[model samples]
Target: EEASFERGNLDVDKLNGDWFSIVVASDKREKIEENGSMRVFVQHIDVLENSLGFTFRIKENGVCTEFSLVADKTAKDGEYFVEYDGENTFTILKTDYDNYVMFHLVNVNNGETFQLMELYGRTKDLSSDIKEKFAKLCVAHGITRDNIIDLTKTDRCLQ
Candidate 1:
């Protein structure tokens, strides 16, 4: 039970690699519900080799772009503010290096708040058990199965 530690005990090591979104479980943000949450493959995270600093690659419509940002206040063993895009906070809800990892994000900006949950893996595949674990975590965050943005054969990351 290595992960059974203080909140800041989240292993930053596991995050510094290439990861592709496989699924998202969350409720809609009212006005944006019709447009759907951010596409599963519309964006991906790339942490610097052996570094906690990371980048975001976003593919919108027919355009692809990337940006970099260093995570602040993440040296502890608990949740920390991501300090990017807006007032964002995140925690490693689940860490399964061999299969999939999960994150819970809450961002507040311009009087609007966005709550997102994502399960990412090296490949586009995850074991059934991992999916279950992710779903439970999402449920723990108050998201129901009916609102989950489940994506499997997504090529949205391809540019």
Candidate 2:
């Protein structure tokens, strides 16, 4: 039988490289975006039974803290699917766009939603314009200006 979610069959090799937390919600964003900046750190990655598990760190003020979350029960690594938690759910679909993946979160519980685009590759020295471009793409995908938060300002650090 075929799996029900796209993220279930993730290309582990493709995800083996470094990734950055580029965005977070405004409430969470403000705290990180202040002072200088924040960031998302991936401490470890594991693939098991069609699930990609991430051990991660969120950093701010040069301090690193850890957190983890499964992509929920409905995400398959190579299929188009949606993860719903009553009113708030996230819809993810793989894209043909090179070096990038996209997901959309609809928080019906709060009457809000945001689009997220993650770029794969080394971004340790990314330019502001590149960062803005990703943010703009999220905006184009229907993320509200006020709802968008740069995750780089949070508790993330270099791997």
CA lDDT of each prediction against the hidden true structure: 0.61, 0.45
Tell me each candidate's RMSD, in Å, in order. Answer: 3.7, 6.8
**lDDT by residue for model 1 (32-67), tens:** 132343443423344444334555555555565566
* Candidate 2 local lDDT, 112-139, one digit each (tens): 4333334322443345655565567566
* lDDT for residue 71 in candidate 1, whole number 0-100: 53
Cα displacement (Å) at residue 53, model 2:
1.2
Error of 2 at 134 (Å): 2.6
In terms of lDDT, model 1 sits at 0.61
The C-alpha local distance difference test score for the whole of candidate 2 amounts to 0.45
Off by over 4 Å in 2: 1-13, 23-44, 59-63, 72-100, 107-121, 125-133, 145-155
